[PDB]
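Record type: ASSEMBLY
Status: queued
Input:
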Amino acid sequence: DRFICIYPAYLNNKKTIAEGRRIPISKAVENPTATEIQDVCSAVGLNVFLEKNKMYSREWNRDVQYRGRVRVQLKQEDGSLCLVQFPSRKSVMLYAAEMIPKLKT
RNA sequence: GAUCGGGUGUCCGCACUAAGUUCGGCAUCAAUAUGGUGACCUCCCGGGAGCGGGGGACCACCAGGUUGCCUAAGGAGGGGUGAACCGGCCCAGGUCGGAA
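Status: finished
Output:
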């Protein structure tokens, strides 16, 4: 249950920094959903599970494309990292916004 | 002192003026030092979230301290709208995050 939280607004380049965005607009994607975040994180070897009805507090869009929250495992509960490539949440958010466009485009 | 010279201001659909009487049109500058506000961009740092700590970049408006290669004149006036989603703020309920 000590898994970090990642919203689709963290990688949304059509959102300002005050609207939820966590990475620059140069390395962010246009409208990533919580299923594109879980699929490209689980495709590198990460422990990710999807909470499809978990919305963002700063998100206002009541429709389905903007809901969702992905919960990623960084530590095996012994303090050690699951992968040495993902030590922080920012290395999980710069990887998913790099592999999401390879899916549909 | 009789007529009466010599000359003006009353009479005009008049000539030109320009203190007022009255309603409109157009128009109404910019740079500095200080602080403030709002946004936005980009980094670190902490967190299971809503979030919290910190470094810069840029934009507009704002207060008021000096000013000008500034005006035909350019107030640091007064007000109103700020909504059907675009100012900021305080935000009931609701609502999203939370075990709270």
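Annotation: Residues 1-5, 7, 16-18, 24-25, 54-60, 69, 71, 89 of chain A lie near RNA strand B (CB under 10 Å from a C1').
Annotation: The two ends of chain A are 34 Å apart (CA to CA).
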